[PDB]
Symmetry: C6
Subunit: 213 residues, 6 copies
């Protein structure tokens, strides 16, 4: 990464390889990726993806998402013809952003320019977009199927509800509706009766402390 | 964090993920969070919360607490209309403090200004307030129910008393009353008689050495 | 490595030795090598290869590849006769690039010159070329033999397909043809019928979500 | 700590938490605490104590010792009334030294002043005084009860003697008397006879090599 | 080591102690030693050898090799008599190079002089010469005894061949002859017939892919 | 340590505690101590000794050795009476060198003076002298009792010989005599006959390769 260029640390590499081995494509793996790739060059970003053995269906899907985003970049940013002047960088293509047709020094060149061409952060967006698709697709449950069991503690139901919700393929407005409609609706008879008496203004804390006893 | 901006270390991330896995929401997890997040940007703070898989009922409660605090900030700090002058930062909203509508550079901008706008430390307050609510709520025992067993060493009773007390949802004045009233009252017959003979001026050390034999 | 010369870190050495022990010559070992050897001198590169015990057939093959590349370098770069002027470096031979006939200071000398003679990155190319040969040769499967089982989830078939494809000894144009022709052709009867109905324009995501149920 | 302020390292935190878990309040835990808290601010010192789960009887005793020392500081250092001048620090109270009524910047302010107000080292004294009380109180043995067994190697007896002595609640003059009187007196008949023949001028080395055979 | 003098890192020490415990005097232990001792002073080099418990026959042999080399140095470098001038270092003896009659500051003095007296790299040569003797002597097999089994995969035979070859006590010209003569000669009947048909121009890759089926 | 003063690292502390737990007072523990305490202040040196739990007979012996050396220092260095001038350090006593009557800043003061008063290296000498006494005393074998078994490989005998020799309480001239006289004398009949035929000029390598078959 760039803090001056610096090689990606052995501990960073190992941490990323381990989380993929241990947790596959659970939602929390994405902010971990983002955190381990802070200030990453495209080279560093490719290093992290390429160090993954297994899961090659997902890694292939990720490539295709990356290529779509790169093609969309090219459409919006047509490269102008001409010789590059002294002390200037060429305009980066989608493939340059993704690290395949640009060198490390060119990536250092773009990232440290005034004003910067933040190719690391652009490529990182595309990767996370692709990781989101994989997380959503590899989710085993739908939010409509999360229903509290007759002897299930409310805390356990809410844990499963919001785990599934975090994986759901929907915006925040839709997520608000899922919380507003389904959470109380799919609680068990006794807790569902208690929560309806609180009303639709109740906080999660209130709902949880209400169905505690 | 900021010491110059620095990426959050793999060891810091792993340490935080591990403590949540191992200890859930035991009281000691909060000073650990605070220690691992020293000089954290809002981005760093969101990274730590977002890297948690599981416990999504608590993580959702935390979001709601964060949103309440953000709304209260907005009420007390109405944003003034106008173009931002050269070499000045805009006034941060609650959502900017919580890292959702502000960039990393804006957070660096506020935190390193003269005088500083300490958005990292403000957001950290809100998070710890929310973690406190969770710790208190997830506590399995009340301080009124802590009673020394007939063959229980006094040290073991006092260990359970102050563990439960640390989790209790009360101020220091109330905690002083709990110590002043309940500790001796709920000791076993033989130790309770011994402690009443010491009187209400006795230190914990004195009380413990008295009920040793 | 050079960031100023720096000794190769114990953690870097151990990380490289471990990955060879654990994963042998799986495709992902190569980007790991590359990542652990960022800014490496030829001395550092020889250190990493020489620290491997076992697999000496592969390590010998690697030497021969290195020697071929070194001989090809010498052919293209005939050394000119004459005394080296003050504040100048001699032209490096293939053996100098590979670290056997050059000193550490000479490698520092070439790598930090204006303009640089990037002997570390040249030798690293030759090593990775040789590692590729080994990976390809040590692959146990051919892409033609990857066929979906009658009760095999499509995701598992695609995982095996692209794992084998990554090891295949072919260019990207050939790889595109392998994806275009074989993937659908060697799916099981029920999924193969479904994928033909999508057509040859379908993304991997689409193909995978189609054969999910 | 301060080396410039620096956040307490994850490895330091973990090392302290582990030693308390593993060794409880064995005498060697105190120099470990001191070593792990070198140049610590009061904030850092509270972080270390607060990260301890369990042992809350001891942690409460420690608080009370801290409060006694803070009250004694206040008595000896009455705060003078007046506005604090430009480029000056206020006089710290006991609660400021203990980190509860002072900010981190105020602690940095006192510790880096010319001349310094070493609030970190003052609070560290109070903590170690309190840890000593706990170690002494939690010791299971008295030095008077350490007696060499009839078939016990002298080295093993001396190991138990000085382990118990290190925990004893006594000054060095008293410790010298314990060594001068009890060590030889409570040896077994055969070794006790041998040691009396050496006389009271003998070194520990001499005493140990004498009772070897 | 010197990068300014720096103490040898705990991780470096532990890494060296572990490799000796785990791998004894396998050939790969030598480049590991060299890598862990980059820029080492003679003091650092003695630290590494002295931290080895066990294997004292080998460590004694190493001392004798070191003493031979030191005596040879003294013969070639007779020390000239006279007072050492201001801002000059004395000429180092063999014992000074080996760290026994020189101080740390004297070693820093020689290593950082203009031009340098590279006593660290000289002593490191002598140690590696001695380690080579030990590796060769402690090798359990001769290259003449490596013969392919009738059902042994060619890769396994070649692995054993070059493992034994790496330990052999011979120059590269002799090693070339061992490869040219023995490798094919001591293959099993079926593979030996196949390899003779390739001819003496064949690469190892070619020989291995030929005897694959 | 001092590299500027620096706190002793958690990894250094743990490494020292572990080696004492694992290896007790084996000869190799002493160079490990020395290596882990490079540039240590007396405070750092006391930290390392004080962090040891158990072995308090040895730790007490060490104190007594330290006190002897401190008393001898005082005898040779009588402190001169007078007020200390501006920008000067007082003459250190034995107790100041051992860290008990001097502060950390005073130790920094002496160690960084021009010319330096190397109190860290002086105290380190005294400690290692005391550790040597303990190693020698705690050795279970005498060099006179090391005799090759009738079916014992010569390498194993030589390993035991030099392990015991390293622990022996004797100078290098005496050690040379032990090697010259006992090693061959206490070999088994068949190897003893072979070694006498080599003569007293033979190297260890020669002796070992001679008794190999
Ligand atoms: Cl994986
Ligand atoms: Cl998965
Ligand atoms: Cl790759
Ligand atoms: Cl360009
Ligand atoms: Cl640009
Ligand atoms: Cl960027
Ligand atoms: Cl479900
Ligand atoms: Cl779930
Ligand atoms: Cl579920
Ligand atoms: Cl409803
Ligand atoms: Cl968790
Ligand atoms: Cl919980
Ligand atoms: Cl997230
Ligand atoms: Cl702004
Ligand atoms: Cl502002
Ligand atoms: Cl802040
Ligand atoms: Cl209870
Ligand atoms: Cl409890
Ligand atoms: Cl309880
Ligand atoms: Cl009462
Ligand atoms: Cl291996
Ligand atoms: Cl393999
Ligand atoms: Cl080698
Ligand atoms: Cl040159
Ligand atoms: Cl050049
Ligand atoms: Cl290079
Ligand atoms: Cl197959
Ligand atoms: Cl496969
Ligand atoms: Cl397969
Ligand atoms: Cl088809
Ligand atoms: Cl604990
Ligand atoms: Cl305890
Ligand atoms: Cl706390
Ligand atoms: Cl103030
Ligand atoms: Cl002040
Ligand atoms: Cl301080
Ligand atoms: Cl006892
Ligand atoms: Cl004991
Ligand atoms: Cl005992
Ligand atoms: Cl007596
Ligand atoms: Cl060993
Ligand atoms: Cl061996
Ligand atoms: Cl030694
Ligand atoms: Cl000199
Ligand atoms: Cl010189
Ligand atoms: Cl050198
Ligand atoms: Cl063999
Ligand atoms: Cl072999
Ligand atoms: Cl073999
Ligand atoms: Cl032949
Ligand atoms: Cl121990
Ligand atoms: Cl022992
Ligand atoms: Cl102590
Ligand atoms: Cl002074
Ligand atoms: Cl002085
Ligand atoms: Cl010193
Ligand atoms: Cl013996
Ligand atoms: Cl032995
Ligand atoms: Cl023995
Ligand atoms: Cl003899």
């Amino acid at each position: 990464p760039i803090v001056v260029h610096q090689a990606i640390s052995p501990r960073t590499l190992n941490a990323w390889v381990k989380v993929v081995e241990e947790k596959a494509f659970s939602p929390e793996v994405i902010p971990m990726f983002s955190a381990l790739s802070e200030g990453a060059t495209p080279q560093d970003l490719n290093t992290m993806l390429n160090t993954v053995g297994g899961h090659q269906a997902a890694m292939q899907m990720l490539k295709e998402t990356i290529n779509e985003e790169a093609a969309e970049w090219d459409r919006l940013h047509p490269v102008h013809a001409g010789p590059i002047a002294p002390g200037q960088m060429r305009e980066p293509r989608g493939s340059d952003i993704a690290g395949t047709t640009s060198t490390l020094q060119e990536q250092i060149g773009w990232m440290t320019h005034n004003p910067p061409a933040p190719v690391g952060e652009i490529y990182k967006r595309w990767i996370i977009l692709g990781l989101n698709k994989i997380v959503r697709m590899y989710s085993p449950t739908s939010i409509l199927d999360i229903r509290q069991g007759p002897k299930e503690p409310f805390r356990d139901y809410v844990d499963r509800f919001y785990k599934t919700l975090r994986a759901e393929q929907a915006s925040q407005e839709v997520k608000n509706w899922m919380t507003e409609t389904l959470l109380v609706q799919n609680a068990n008879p006794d807790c569902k009766t208690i929560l309806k008496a609180l009303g639709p203004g109740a906080t999660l804390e209130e709902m949880m402390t209400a169905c505690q006893g």
